[PDB]
Amino acid sequence: AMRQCAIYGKGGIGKSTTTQNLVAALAEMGKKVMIVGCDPKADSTRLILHSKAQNTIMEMAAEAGTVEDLELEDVLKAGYGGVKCVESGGPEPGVGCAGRGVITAINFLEEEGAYEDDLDFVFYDVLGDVVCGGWAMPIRENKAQEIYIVCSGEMMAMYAANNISKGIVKYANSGSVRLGGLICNSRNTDREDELIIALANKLGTQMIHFVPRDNVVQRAEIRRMTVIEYDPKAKQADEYRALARKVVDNKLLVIPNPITMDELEELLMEFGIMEVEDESIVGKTAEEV
Amino acid sequence: AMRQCAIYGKGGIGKSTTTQNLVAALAEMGKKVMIVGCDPKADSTRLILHSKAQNTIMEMAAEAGTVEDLELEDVLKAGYGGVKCVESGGPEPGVGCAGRGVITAINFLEEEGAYEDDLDFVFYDVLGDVVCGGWAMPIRENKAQEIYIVCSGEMMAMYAANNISKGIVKYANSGSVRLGGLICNSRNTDREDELIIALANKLGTQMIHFVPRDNVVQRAEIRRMTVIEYDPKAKQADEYRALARKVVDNKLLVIPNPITMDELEELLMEFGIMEVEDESIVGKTAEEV
Numbered sequence A, B: 001a002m003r004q005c006a007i008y009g010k011g012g013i014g015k016s017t018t019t020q021n022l023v024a025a026l027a028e029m030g031k032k033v034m035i036v037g038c039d040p041k042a043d044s045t046r047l048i049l050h051s052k053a054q055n056t057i058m059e060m061a062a063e064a065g066t067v068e069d070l071e072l073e074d075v076l077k078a079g080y081g082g083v084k085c086v087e088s089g090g091p092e093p094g095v096g097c098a099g100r101g102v103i104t105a106i107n108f109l110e111e112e113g114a115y116e117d118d119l120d121f122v123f124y125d126v127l128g129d130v131v132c133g134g135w136a137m138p139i140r141e142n143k144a145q146e147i148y149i150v151c152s153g154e155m156m157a158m159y160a161a162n163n164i165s166k167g168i169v170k171y172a173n174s175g176s177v178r179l180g181g182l183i184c185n186s187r188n189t190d191r192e193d194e195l196i197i198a199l200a201n202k203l204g205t206q207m208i209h210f211v212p213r214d215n216v217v218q219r220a221e222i223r224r225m226t227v228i229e230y231d232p233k234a235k236q237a238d239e240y241r242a243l244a245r246k247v248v249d250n251k252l253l254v255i256p257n258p259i260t261m262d263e264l265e266e267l268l269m270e271f272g273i274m275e276v277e278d279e280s281i282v283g284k285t286a287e288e289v
Ligand code: SF4
Pocket: A096, A097, A098, A099, A100, A132, A133, A134, A135, B096, B097, B098, B099, B132, B133, B134, B135
Protein backbone atom coordinates (compact mmCIF):
# COMPACT_ATOMS: atom_id res chain seq x y z
CA ALA A 1 0.00 0.00 0.00
CA MET A 2 1.52 3.29 -1.20
CA ARG A 3 1.58 6.04 1.38
CA GLN A 4 1.12 9.52 -0.01
CA CYS A 5 2.93 12.03 2.05
CA ALA A 6 3.85 15.68 1.92
CA ILE A 7 6.48 17.82 3.60
CA TYR A 8 5.13 21.31 4.22
CA GLY A 9 7.07 24.18 5.74
CA LYS A 10 8.46 27.64 4.97
CA GLY A 11 11.60 28.50 3.07
CA GLY A 12 15.02 29.23 4.48
CA ILE A 13 14.93 26.60 7.23
CA GLY A 14 16.48 23.66 5.30
CA LYS A 15 13.18 21.83 4.45
CA SER A 16 14.31 20.29 1.11
CA THR A 17 17.57 18.95 2.56
CA THR A 18 15.68 17.17 5.34
CA THR A 19 13.10 15.82 2.85
CA GLN A 20 15.90 14.42 0.70
CA ASN A 21 17.90 12.96 3.55
CA LEU A 22 14.79 11.36 5.11
CA VAL A 23 13.95 9.90 1.69
CA ALA A 24 17.57 8.65 1.27
CA ALA A 25 17.53 6.95 4.67
CA LEU A 26 14.26 5.38 3.61
CA ALA A 27 15.80 3.95 0.41
CA GLU A 28 18.84 2.54 2.26
CA MET A 29 16.13 0.96 4.42
CA GLY A 30 14.72 -0.92 1.34
CA LYS A 31 11.77 1.38 0.45
CA LYS A 32 10.80 2.36 -3.08
CA VAL A 33 10.27 6.19 -2.97
CA MET A 34 9.43 9.03 -5.33
CA ILE A 35 10.17 12.71 -4.55
CA VAL A 36 7.86 15.15 -6.31
CA GLY A 37 9.18 18.69 -5.83
CA CYS A 38 6.61 21.47 -5.59
CA ASP A 39 8.71 24.45 -4.44
CA PRO A 40 9.35 27.35 -6.95
CA LYS A 41 13.05 26.69 -6.58
CA ALA A 42 13.97 23.28 -8.04
CA ASP A 43 15.90 22.21 -4.89
CA SER A 44 13.92 19.07 -3.96
CA THR A 45 15.76 16.43 -6.08
CA ARG A 46 19.27 17.82 -6.40
CA LEU A 47 20.87 15.93 -3.56
CA ILE A 48 19.42 12.63 -4.91
CA LEU A 49 20.52 13.11 -8.56
CA HIS A 50 23.87 14.92 -7.90
CA SER A 51 22.32 17.64 -9.97
CA LYS A 52 22.92 21.34 -10.20
CA ALA A 53 19.22 21.62 -11.18
CA GLN A 54 16.58 19.13 -12.38
CA ASN A 55 14.43 19.87 -15.44
CA THR A 56 11.00 20.72 -14.24
CA ILE A 57 7.62 19.80 -15.76
CA MET A 58 7.01 23.58 -16.08
CA GLU A 59 10.07 24.33 -18.21
CA MET A 60 9.77 21.16 -20.33
CA ALA A 61 6.11 21.97 -21.00
CA ALA A 62 7.27 25.44 -22.13
CA GLU A 63 9.66 23.66 -24.53
CA ALA A 64 7.30 21.01 -25.91
CA GLY A 65 4.23 23.33 -26.18
CA THR A 66 1.84 21.53 -23.79
CA VAL A 67 2.37 19.13 -20.88
CA GLU A 68 1.07 16.14 -22.88
CA ASP A 69 3.89 16.41 -25.37
CA LEU A 70 6.61 15.22 -22.97
CA GLU A 71 7.56 11.70 -22.08
CA LEU A 72 7.77 10.44 -18.50
CA GLU A 73 11.39 9.30 -19.10
CA ASP A 74 12.28 13.00 -19.34
CA VAL A 75 10.41 14.08 -16.21
CA LEU A 76 11.14 11.17 -13.84
CA LYS A 77 14.82 10.65 -13.21
CA ALA A 78 16.22 8.01 -10.78
CA GLY A 79 19.10 8.83 -8.42
CA TYR A 80 20.61 7.32 -5.24
CA GLY A 81 18.83 4.20 -3.99
CA GLY A 82 16.81 4.26 -7.21
CA VAL A 83 14.77 7.15 -5.70
CA LYS A 84 12.58 8.51 -8.46
CA CYS A 85 12.78 12.28 -8.92
CA VAL A 86 10.30 14.76 -10.32
CA GLU A 87 10.47 18.52 -10.07
CA SER A 88 7.23 20.21 -11.19
CA GLY A 89 8.55 23.76 -11.54
CA GLY A 90 7.47 27.01 -9.97
CA PRO A 91 4.63 29.35 -11.11
CA GLU A 92 5.71 31.24 -14.06
CA PRO A 93 6.41 34.75 -12.72
CA GLY A 94 3.59 37.23 -12.81
CA VAL A 95 1.11 34.57 -14.05
CA GLY A 96 0.02 31.12 -12.98
CA CYS A 97 -1.00 29.67 -9.76
CA ALA A 98 1.41 27.62 -7.77
CA GLY A 99 -1.45 25.22 -7.04
CA ARG A 100 -2.40 24.79 -10.67
CA GLY A 101 1.17 23.98 -11.61
CA VAL A 102 1.36 21.38 -8.87
CA ILE A 103 -1.88 19.52 -9.75
CA THR A 104 -0.87 19.83 -13.44
CA ALA A 105 2.20 17.88 -12.45
CA ILE A 106 0.41 15.29 -10.33
CA ASN A 107 -2.09 14.49 -13.09
CA PHE A 108 0.68 14.04 -15.71
CA LEU A 109 2.27 11.39 -13.48
CA GLU A 110 -1.02 9.61 -12.80
CA GLU A 111 -1.72 9.13 -16.50
CA GLU A 112 1.80 8.13 -17.28
CA GLY A 113 1.50 5.47 -14.53
CA ALA A 114 4.29 6.48 -12.19
CA TYR A 115 2.26 5.88 -9.02
CA GLU A 116 0.93 2.48 -10.03
CA ASP A 117 4.46 1.28 -10.71
CA ASP A 118 5.70 -0.29 -7.38
CA LEU A 119 6.11 2.39 -4.85
CA ASP A 120 6.06 2.44 -1.09
CA PHE A 121 6.20 6.23 -0.63
CA VAL A 122 5.39 9.43 -2.42
CA PHE A 123 6.81 12.62 -0.92
CA TYR A 124 5.67 15.99 -2.20
CA ASP A 125 8.01 18.79 -1.08
CA VAL A 126 5.63 21.71 -0.91
CA LEU A 127 6.00 25.33 0.18
CA GLY A 128 3.99 26.13 3.26
CA ASP A 129 4.25 29.71 4.29
CA VAL A 130 1.26 31.61 2.96
CA VAL A 131 -1.24 28.79 2.76
CA CYS A 132 -3.47 30.23 0.10
CA GLY A 133 -5.87 27.96 -1.84
CA GLY A 134 -3.03 27.35 -4.32
CA TRP A 135 -0.37 26.05 -1.95
CA ALA A 136 -3.19 24.27 -0.15
CA MET A 137 -4.20 22.37 -3.33
CA PRO A 138 -2.30 19.05 -2.61
CA ILE A 139 -4.39 18.96 0.60
CA ARG A 140 -7.68 19.87 -1.12
CA GLU A 141 -7.32 17.45 -4.05
CA ASN A 142 -6.26 14.78 -1.54
CA LYS A 143 -2.99 13.94 -3.29
CA ALA A 144 -1.18 13.68 0.06
CA GLN A 145 -2.64 12.12 3.21
CA GLU A 146 0.28 12.27 5.64
CA ILE A 147 1.58 15.79 6.10
CA TYR A 148 4.76 16.42 8.05
CA ILE A 149 5.56 20.01 8.84
CA VAL A 150 9.26 21.02 8.95
CA CYS A 151 9.66 24.01 11.27
CA SER A 152 11.99 25.46 13.97
CA GLY A 153 12.00 27.53 17.18
CA GLU A 154 11.54 30.80 15.38
CA MET A 155 8.43 32.97 15.10
CA MET A 156 7.77 32.71 11.34
CA ALA A 157 8.49 28.98 11.06
CA MET A 158 6.08 28.29 13.95
CA TYR A 159 3.45 30.62 12.48
CA ALA A 160 3.83 28.79 9.14
CA ALA A 161 3.30 25.46 10.97
CA ASN A 162 0.07 26.69 12.49
CA ASN A 163 -1.13 27.97 9.12
CA ILE A 164 -0.39 24.63 7.44
CA SER A 165 -2.40 23.11 10.31
CA LYS A 166 -5.35 25.43 9.65
CA GLY A 167 -5.10 24.32 6.04
CA ILE A 168 -5.50 20.69 7.00
CA VAL A 169 -8.42 21.51 9.38
CA LYS A 170 -10.18 23.21 6.47
CA TYR A 171 -10.30 19.98 4.45
CA ALA A 172 -10.72 17.47 7.31
CA ASN A 173 -14.29 16.67 6.39
CA SER A 174 -13.61 16.25 2.67
CA GLY A 175 -11.01 13.49 3.01
CA SER A 176 -8.14 11.72 4.63
CA VAL A 177 -5.58 14.58 4.87
CA ARG A 178 -4.01 14.44 8.35
CA LEU A 179 -1.06 15.85 10.29
CA GLY A 180 1.55 13.19 10.97
CA GLY A 181 3.90 15.38 13.07
CA LEU A 182 6.43 18.22 13.28
CA ILE A 183 10.07 17.80 12.26
CA CYS A 184 12.27 20.40 13.94
CA ASN A 185 15.19 21.64 11.79
CA SER A 186 17.41 22.93 14.52
CA ARG A 187 18.76 26.41 14.49
CA ASN A 188 20.69 25.67 17.74
CA THR A 189 18.59 28.06 19.87
CA ASP A 190 18.34 27.12 23.51
CA ARG A 191 14.92 25.65 24.26
CA GLU A 192 14.12 24.69 20.68
CA ASP A 193 13.34 21.00 21.16
CA GLU A 194 11.03 21.70 24.14
CA LEU A 195 9.35 24.61 22.37
CA ILE A 196 8.52 22.52 19.30
CA ILE A 197 7.31 19.68 21.56
CA ALA A 198 5.09 22.24 23.35
CA LEU A 199 3.72 23.47 20.01
CA ALA A 200 3.11 19.88 18.89
CA ASN A 201 1.11 19.27 22.06
CA LYS A 202 -1.09 22.36 21.66
CA LEU A 203 -1.61 21.25 18.06
CA GLY A 204 -2.51 17.66 19.12
CA THR A 205 0.42 15.95 17.29
CA GLN A 206 4.06 15.14 18.20
CA MET A 207 7.47 16.37 17.33
CA ILE A 208 8.33 13.25 15.27
CA HIS A 209 12.08 14.16 15.28
CA PHE A 210 14.71 16.76 16.08
CA VAL A 211 17.20 17.17 13.21
CA PRO A 212 20.28 18.93 14.64
CA ARG A 213 22.64 21.38 13.01
CA ASP A 214 25.72 19.39 11.95
CA ASN A 215 28.47 20.54 9.59
CA VAL A 216 28.36 17.15 7.78
CA VAL A 217 25.03 18.30 6.30
CA GLN A 218 26.83 21.18 4.59
CA ARG A 219 29.82 19.01 3.58
CA ALA A 220 27.48 16.49 2.05
CA GLU A 221 25.23 18.98 0.32
CA ILE A 222 28.10 20.92 -1.21
CA ARG A 223 28.90 17.64 -3.01
CA ARG A 224 25.21 17.65 -4.11
CA MET A 225 24.39 14.64 -1.95
CA THR A 226 22.67 13.43 1.20
CA VAL A 227 24.58 12.64 4.42
CA ILE A 228 23.27 9.03 4.00
CA GLU A 229 25.19 8.56 0.75
CA TYR A 230 28.16 10.78 1.59
CA ASP A 231 29.00 9.51 5.08
CA PRO A 232 26.76 6.54 5.98
CA LYS A 233 28.36 6.09 9.42
CA ALA A 234 28.07 9.66 10.59
CA LYS A 235 26.13 10.71 13.66
CA GLN A 236 23.69 12.68 11.48
CA ALA A 237 23.04 9.72 9.16
CA ASP A 238 21.51 7.88 12.13
CA GLU A 239 19.37 10.92 12.91
CA TYR A 240 17.88 10.59 9.46
CA ARG A 241 17.41 6.87 9.91
CA ALA A 242 15.66 7.51 13.24
CA LEU A 243 13.34 9.99 11.50
CA ALA A 244 12.80 7.61 8.56
CA ARG A 245 12.02 4.79 10.99
CA LYS A 246 9.51 6.81 13.06
CA VAL A 247 7.76 7.97 9.83
CA VAL A 248 7.39 4.39 8.61
CA ASP A 249 6.14 3.27 11.93
CA ASN A 250 3.82 6.30 12.48
CA LYS A 251 0.20 5.84 13.31
CA LEU A 252 -0.45 9.21 14.99
CA LEU A 253 -2.33 10.92 12.17
CA VAL A 254 -4.60 13.67 13.37
CA ILE A 255 -6.82 16.67 12.76
CA PRO A 256 -4.76 19.45 14.51
CA ASN A 257 -5.92 22.09 16.96
CA PRO A 258 -4.58 25.52 15.74
CA ILE A 259 -3.59 28.05 18.35
CA THR A 260 -4.14 31.83 18.46
CA MET A 261 -1.40 34.48 17.89
CA ASP A 262 -1.46 35.15 21.64
CA GLU A 263 -0.84 31.50 22.42
CA LEU A 264 1.99 31.43 19.80
CA GLU A 265 3.56 34.35 21.69
CA GLU A 266 3.01 32.68 25.14
CA LEU A 267 5.01 29.71 24.02
CA LEU A 268 7.72 31.95 22.47
CA MET A 269 7.94 34.12 25.59
CA GLU A 270 8.21 31.30 28.13
CA PHE A 271 10.84 29.46 26.07
CA GLY A 272 12.84 32.71 25.80
CA ILE A 273 12.74 33.56 22.04
CA MET A 274 10.37 36.46 22.58
CA GLU A 275 11.02 39.13 25.16
CA VAL A 276 8.17 40.33 27.32
CA GLU A 277 7.06 43.75 26.06
CA ASP A 278 7.06 46.73 28.31
CA GLU A 279 3.84 48.68 27.85
CA SER A 280 5.07 51.90 29.39
CA ILE A 281 7.63 52.73 26.67
CA VAL A 282 5.30 52.20 23.68
CA GLY A 283 4.87 55.26 21.58
CA LYS A 284 7.45 57.08 23.72
CA THR A 285 10.51 58.68 22.27
CA ALA A 286 14.10 58.68 23.62
CA GLU A 287 13.20 62.01 25.18
CA GLU A 288 10.45 60.67 27.41
CA VAL A 289 12.61 57.70 28.45
CA ALA B 1 -0.64 64.18 -8.68
CA MET B 2 -0.77 61.06 -6.49
CA ARG B 3 2.03 58.60 -7.05
CA GLN B 4 1.07 54.98 -6.62
CA CYS B 5 3.96 52.97 -5.39
CA ALA B 6 4.67 49.51 -4.11
CA ILE B 7 7.40 47.96 -2.01
CA TYR B 8 8.02 44.38 -3.12
CA GLY B 9 10.49 41.98 -1.54
CA LYS B 10 10.73 38.71 0.38
CA GLY B 11 10.15 38.15 4.08
CA GLY B 12 12.71 38.07 6.85
CA ILE B 13 14.86 40.92 5.50
CA GLY B 14 13.14 43.84 7.33
CA LYS B 15 11.01 45.08 4.36
CA SER B 16 8.06 46.45 6.40
CA THR B 17 10.32 48.40 8.80
CA THR B 18 12.04 50.16 5.88
CA THR B 19 8.65 50.84 4.20
CA GLN B 20 7.39 52.44 7.41
CA ASN B 21 10.50 54.44 8.10
CA LEU B 22 10.70 55.69 4.51
CA VAL B 23 7.02 56.68 4.76
CA ALA B 24 7.67 58.41 8.14
CA ALA B 25 10.58 60.42 6.73
CA LEU B 26 8.28 61.35 3.88
CA ALA B 27 5.62 62.68 6.29
CA GLU B 28 8.14 64.72 8.34
CA MET B 29 9.03 66.07 4.87
CA GLY B 30 5.43 67.41 4.43
CA LYS B 31 3.94 64.62 2.25
CA LYS B 32 0.46 63.18 2.69
CA VAL B 33 0.92 59.34 2.57
CA MET B 34 -1.15 56.20 2.92
CA ILE B 35 0.34 52.76 3.73
CA VAL B 36 -1.73 49.85 2.46
CA GLY B 37 -0.35 46.60 3.92
CA CYS B 38 -0.58 43.52 1.72
CA ASP B 39 1.61 40.99 3.60
CA PRO B 40 -0.08 38.00 5.38
CA LYS B 41 1.40 39.23 8.61
CA ALA B 42 -0.15 42.60 9.62
CA ASP B 43 3.28 44.23 10.21
CA SER B 44 3.02 47.12 7.70
CA THR B 45 1.32 49.79 9.87
CA ARG B 46 2.38 48.90 13.40
CA LEU B 47 5.30 51.29 13.68
CA ILE B 48 3.10 54.18 12.46
CA LEU B 49 0.14 53.52 14.82
CA HIS B 50 2.14 52.31 17.89
CA SER B 51 0.06 49.21 17.47
CA LYS B 52 0.58 45.63 18.51
CA ALA B 53 -1.54 44.70 15.43
CA GLN B 54 -3.90 46.65 13.14
CA ASN B 55 -7.36 45.30 12.29
CA THR B 56 -7.28 44.06 8.77
CA ILE B 57 -9.96 44.33 6.07
CA MET B 58 -9.93 40.50 6.01
CA GLU B 59 -10.77 40.01 9.69
CA MET B 60 -13.30 42.88 9.82
CA ALA B 61 -15.04 41.47 6.73
CA ALA B 62 -15.21 38.13 8.57
CA GLU B 63 -16.90 39.99 11.46
CA ALA B 64 -19.34 42.12 9.46
CA GLY B 65 -20.29 39.36 6.95
CA THR B 66 -19.12 40.99 3.69
CA VAL B 67 -16.58 43.72 2.91
CA GLU B 68 -19.30 46.28 2.07
CA ASP B 69 -20.63 46.19 5.61
CA LEU B 70 -17.65 47.99 7.15
CA GLU B 71 -17.01 51.69 7.37
CA LEU B 72 -13.78 53.31 6.16
CA GLU B 73 -13.28 54.91 9.62
CA ASP B 74 -12.69 51.37 10.92
CA VAL B 75 -10.24 50.34 8.19
CA LEU B 76 -8.20 53.52 7.74
CA LYS B 77 -6.45 54.66 10.89
CA ALA B 78 -4.10 57.69 11.05
CA GLY B 79 -0.81 57.54 12.97
CA TYR B 80 2.44 59.55 13.13
CA GLY B 81 2.55 62.49 10.70
CA GLY B 82 -1.10 61.81 9.95
CA VAL B 83 0.01 58.79 7.83
CA LYS B 84 -3.09 56.88 6.90
CA CYS B 85 -2.91 53.15 7.65
CA VAL B 86 -4.71 50.22 6.12
CA GLU B 87 -3.89 46.55 6.58
CA SER B 88 -5.77 44.30 4.13
CA GLY B 89 -5.17 40.97 5.87
CA GLY B 90 -3.60 37.75 4.67
CA PRO B 91 -5.28 34.93 2.66
CA GLU B 92 -7.39 32.95 4.92
CA PRO B 93 -5.42 29.71 5.47
CA GLY B 94 -6.10 26.87 3.13
CA VAL B 95 -8.45 28.99 0.98
CA GLY B 96 -8.47 31.97 -1.41
CA CYS B 97 -6.08 33.79 -3.70
CA ALA B 98 -3.84 36.14 -1.83
CA GLY B 99 -3.99 38.45 -4.84
CA ARG B 100 -7.77 38.52 -4.98
CA GLY B 101 -7.98 39.37 -1.31
CA VAL B 102 -5.55 42.22 -1.79
CA ILE B 103 -7.30 43.85 -4.80
CA THR B 104 -10.68 43.39 -3.02
CA ALA B 105 -9.19 45.68 -0.31
CA ILE B 106 -7.96 48.23 -2.83
CA ASN B 107 -11.43 48.31 -4.47
CA PHE B 108 -12.99 48.91 -1.00
CA LEU B 109 -10.77 51.99 -0.59
CA GLU B 110 -11.51 53.31 -4.08
CA GLU B 111 -15.26 53.31 -3.48
CA GLU B 112 -14.93 54.75 -0.03
CA GLY B 113 -12.87 57.58 -1.57
CA ALA B 114 -9.59 57.25 0.30
CA TYR B 115 -7.42 57.85 -2.77
CA GLU B 116 -9.30 60.88 -4.01
CA ASP B 117 -8.92 62.53 -0.61
CA ASP B 118 -5.64 64.59 -0.82
CA LEU B 119 -2.76 62.27 -1.05
CA ASP B 120 0.73 62.59 -2.43
CA PHE B 121 1.76 58.92 -2.06
CA VAL B 122 0.28 55.48 -1.84
CA PHE B 123 2.62 52.70 -0.70
CA TYR B 124 1.53 49.09 -0.97
CA ASP B 125 3.77 46.79 1.12
CA VAL B 126 3.54 43.59 -0.86
CA LEU B 127 5.21 40.18 -0.51
CA GLY B 128 7.53 39.41 -3.38
CA ASP B 129 9.09 36.02 -3.13
CA VAL B 130 7.11 33.56 -5.24
CA VAL B 131 5.66 35.96 -7.79
CA CYS B 132 2.65 33.95 -8.76
CA GLY B 133 -0.31 35.62 -10.56
CA GLY B 134 -1.88 36.32 -7.17
CA TRP B 135 0.97 38.45 -5.80
CA ALA B 136 1.53 39.98 -9.22
CA MET B 137 -2.04 41.41 -9.31
CA PRO B 138 -1.18 45.00 -8.09
CA ILE B 139 1.12 45.10 -11.14
CA ARG B 140 -1.41 43.57 -13.56
CA GLU B 141 -4.39 45.64 -12.38
CA ASN B 142 -2.06 48.62 -12.51
CA LYS B 143 -2.73 49.76 -8.96
CA ALA B 144 0.96 50.58 -8.43
CA GLN B 145 3.22 52.18 -11.05
CA GLU B 146 6.46 52.68 -9.14
CA ILE B 147 7.80 49.44 -7.71
CA TYR B 148 10.74 49.46 -5.36
CA ILE B 149 12.22 46.12 -4.48
CA VAL B 150 13.67 45.66 -0.97
CA CYS B 151 16.39 42.99 -1.06
CA SER B 152 19.85 42.14 0.34
CA GLY B 153 23.12 40.38 -0.53
CA GLU B 154 21.73 36.94 0.01
CA MET B 155 20.74 34.32 -2.56
CA MET B 156 16.99 34.15 -1.91
CA ALA B 157 16.48 37.90 -1.55
CA MET B 158 18.27 38.48 -4.85
CA TYR B 159 16.34 35.67 -6.55
CA ALA B 160 13.12 37.24 -5.26
CA ALA B 161 14.19 40.60 -6.74
CA ASN B 162 14.73 39.04 -10.14
CA ASN B 163 11.35 37.32 -9.95
CA ILE B 164 9.58 40.56 -9.05
CA SER B 165 11.40 42.03 -12.09
CA LYS B 166 10.12 39.25 -14.36
CA GLY B 167 6.68 40.05 -13.00
CA ILE B 168 6.98 43.66 -14.09
CA VAL B 169 8.34 42.64 -17.55
CA LYS B 170 5.27 40.44 -18.03
CA TYR B 171 2.91 43.43 -17.78
CA ALA B 172 5.13 46.10 -19.42
CA ASN B 173 2.99 46.30 -22.54
CA SER B 174 -0.33 46.47 -20.66
CA GLY B 175 0.47 49.59 -18.63
CA SER B 176 2.68 51.89 -16.70
CA VAL B 177 4.13 49.49 -14.10
CA ARG B 178 7.87 50.15 -13.84
CA LEU B 179 10.85 49.36 -11.59
CA GLY B 180 11.99 52.44 -9.70
CA GLY B 181 15.01 50.80 -7.99
CA LEU B 182 16.43 48.40 -5.39
CA ILE B 183 16.61 49.25 -1.70
CA CYS B 184 19.26 47.17 0.07
CA ASN B 185 18.37 46.19 3.67
CA SER B 186 21.81 45.47 4.94
CA ARG B 187 22.69 42.25 6.60
CA ASN B 188 26.26 43.54 7.20
CA THR B 189 27.88 41.08 4.75
CA ASP B 190 31.08 42.28 3.19
CA ARG B 191 30.47 43.31 -0.43
CA GLU B 192 26.73 43.80 -0.05
CA ASP B 193 26.43 47.38 -1.35
CA GLU B 194 28.53 46.59 -4.43
CA LEU B 195 26.60 43.39 -5.10
CA ILE B 196 23.17 45.16 -5.16
CA ILE B 197 24.73 47.95 -7.21
CA ALA B 198 25.80 45.19 -9.69
CA LEU B 199 22.45 43.44 -9.50
CA ALA B 200 20.69 46.67 -10.19
CA ASN B 201 23.03 47.24 -13.09
CA LYS B 202 22.42 43.84 -14.78
CA LEU B 203 18.71 44.48 -14.15
CA GLY B 204 18.86 47.96 -15.79
CA THR B 205 17.86 49.94 -12.62
CA GLN B 206 19.80 51.42 -9.65
CA MET B 207 20.29 50.67 -6.04
CA ILE B 208 18.19 53.67 -4.88
CA HIS B 209 19.57 53.39 -1.29
CA PHE B 210 21.57 51.35 1.18
CA VAL B 211 19.78 51.07 4.55
CA PRO B 212 22.39 49.99 7.13
CA ARG B 213 22.00 47.80 10.18
CA ASP B 214 21.74 50.16 13.17
CA ASN B 215 20.63 49.24 16.69
CA VAL B 216 18.40 52.36 16.81
CA VAL B 217 16.09 50.55 14.37
CA GLN B 218 15.53 47.84 16.99
CA ARG B 219 15.25 50.36 19.86
CA ALA B 220 12.66 52.30 17.91
CA GLU B 221 10.68 49.31 16.72
CA ILE B 222 10.50 47.72 20.15
CA ARG B 223 8.60 50.90 21.13
CA ARG B 224 6.35 50.18 18.09
CA MET B 225 7.63 53.20 16.21
CA THR B 226 9.84 54.44 13.36
CA VAL B 227 13.35 55.84 13.94
CA ILE B 228 11.98 59.12 12.44
CA GLU B 229 9.51 59.58 15.29
CA TYR B 230 11.61 57.97 18.03
CA ASP B 231 14.83 59.99 17.38
CA PRO B 232 14.56 62.70 14.64
CA LYS B 233 18.33 63.31 14.78
CA ALA B 234 19.71 59.79 14.74
CA LYS B 235 22.21 58.84 12.00
CA GLN B 236 19.69 56.31 10.68
CA ALA B 237 16.86 58.88 10.52
CA ASP B 238 18.87 60.76 7.89
CA GLU B 239 19.38 57.53 5.95
CA TYR B 240 15.62 57.27 5.70
CA ARG B 241 15.33 60.91 4.70
CA ALA B 242 17.99 60.34 2.01
CA LEU B 243 15.98 57.38 0.70
CA ALA B 244 12.70 59.33 0.94
CA ARG B 245 14.29 62.23 -0.93
CA LYS B 246 15.73 60.07 -3.76
CA VAL B 247 12.33 58.34 -4.18
CA VAL B 248 10.54 61.69 -4.53
CA ASP B 249 13.12 62.95 -6.91
CA ASN B 250 13.30 59.66 -8.95
CA LYS B 251 12.84 59.65 -12.66
CA LEU B 252 14.51 56.28 -13.21
CA LEU B 253 11.37 54.18 -13.88
CA VAL B 254 12.33 51.15 -16.03
CA ILE B 255 11.17 47.94 -17.61
CA PRO B 256 13.89 45.68 -16.01
CA ASN B 257 16.15 43.15 -17.68
CA PRO B 258 15.96 39.85 -15.65
CA ILE B 259 19.10 37.76 -15.37
CA THR B 260 19.56 33.98 -15.54
CA MET B 261 20.34 31.71 -12.51
CA ASP B 262 23.90 31.41 -13.81
CA GLU B 263 24.29 35.18 -13.88
CA LEU B 264 22.81 35.40 -10.35
CA GLU B 265 25.50 32.95 -9.26
CA GLU B 266 28.30 34.84 -11.14
CA LEU B 267 27.48 37.96 -9.19
CA LEU B 268 27.28 36.01 -5.89
CA MET B 269 30.57 34.20 -6.55
CA GLU B 270 32.63 37.29 -7.50
CA PHE B 271 31.32 39.27 -4.51
CA GLY B 272 32.22 36.33 -2.23
CA ILE B 273 28.80 35.11 -0.91
CA MET B 274 28.93 31.96 -2.99
CA GLU B 275 31.94 29.69 -3.03
CA VAL B 276 33.16 28.30 -6.30
CA GLU B 277 32.11 24.65 -6.57
CA ASP B 278 34.64 21.94 -7.05
CA GLU B 279 33.40 19.51 -9.67
CA SER B 280 35.71 16.68 -8.73
CA ILE B 281 34.17 15.97 -5.32
CA VAL B 282 30.53 15.84 -6.50
CA GLY B 283 28.87 12.55 -5.84
CA LYS B 284 31.97 11.36 -4.00
CA THR B 285 31.88 10.09 -0.47
CA ALA B 286 34.34 10.76 2.38
CA GLU B 287 35.98 7.50 1.35
CA GLU B 288 36.94 8.64 -2.13
CA VAL B 289 38.20 11.98 -0.79
S1 SF4 C 1 -4.00 31.04 -5.17
FE1 SF4 C 1 -2.09 31.44 -4.18
S2 SF4 C 1 -0.47 30.36 -5.56
FE2 SF4 C 1 -2.38 30.67 -6.76
S3 SF4 C 1 -2.22 32.62 -7.88
FE3 SF4 C 1 -3.24 33.02 -5.78
S4 SF4 C 1 -1.71 33.68 -4.27
FE4 SF4 C 1 -0.73 32.52 -6.11
